Structures are given as structure tokens and as C-alpha cells.
DNA sequence: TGAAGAGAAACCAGAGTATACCAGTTACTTCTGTAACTCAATTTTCGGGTCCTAGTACACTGATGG
């Protein structure tokens, strides 16, 4: 349990934003861009 | 018996002479690229926040005047 609480402890540290999801909430982790239009 | 030069002891600039830098170039190296795995250090870049000062909307207030 104390060992959890240790990896608990370092998945915080190595925690990170809700920018990232907006208007094009679909993006490459690549060149960052949306997918094409729907038909709509 | 002076005359026209003869000799003599000073200055004075200048032409070789003496330096005095000032470039003029031959080898003889490193340093590229590519490849690779490694790891850490360092930089870049990149999307998003972050704080701050300055207006802005908007419902309400508070008279105000005719």
C-alpha cells in the first residue's frame, strides 16, 4: 500500500490540459490538425 | 702696385646608406557527410495557460423635471 501511494505520488508528478480539446477536439499527434469536414 | 685669381677655413644640403617594418606566399593539417547504437545535456518550439490592466454589458438606483 505504501508503495502505491508511491507510484500514486510520481503519476502526479508525472501528471499533466482542457485547451488541447477545443473546437477541434480531434487532432494528429502528429501535424495537430482535425479531420476533414463532414458533409454536414 | 694693385688685379685677377690662389689658397684657406667655416657652413649646408643631399645622395647613397642604413635600417625598419610590412606584406607575400607552400605546406600541412582539420573538417566536413553517412552510418549506427548508446545516454545525457542542451536547445528549440509549441500549445496552452496566466496574470493584469482596461473597458463593457446590464440590471438596478436615484434623482429630476415637466
Known amino acids: ?7 500514486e505520488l510520481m503519476r502526479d508528478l508525472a501528471g499533466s490540459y482542457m485547451g488541447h480539446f477545443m473546437k477541434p477536439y480531434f487532432k494528429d499527434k502528429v501535424t495537430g490538425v482535425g479531420p476533414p ?3 454536414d
Do not use: T, Y
Open 1 to 7: 500500500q505504501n508503495r502505491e501511494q508511491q507510484e
Open 37 to 39: 469536414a463532414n458533409e
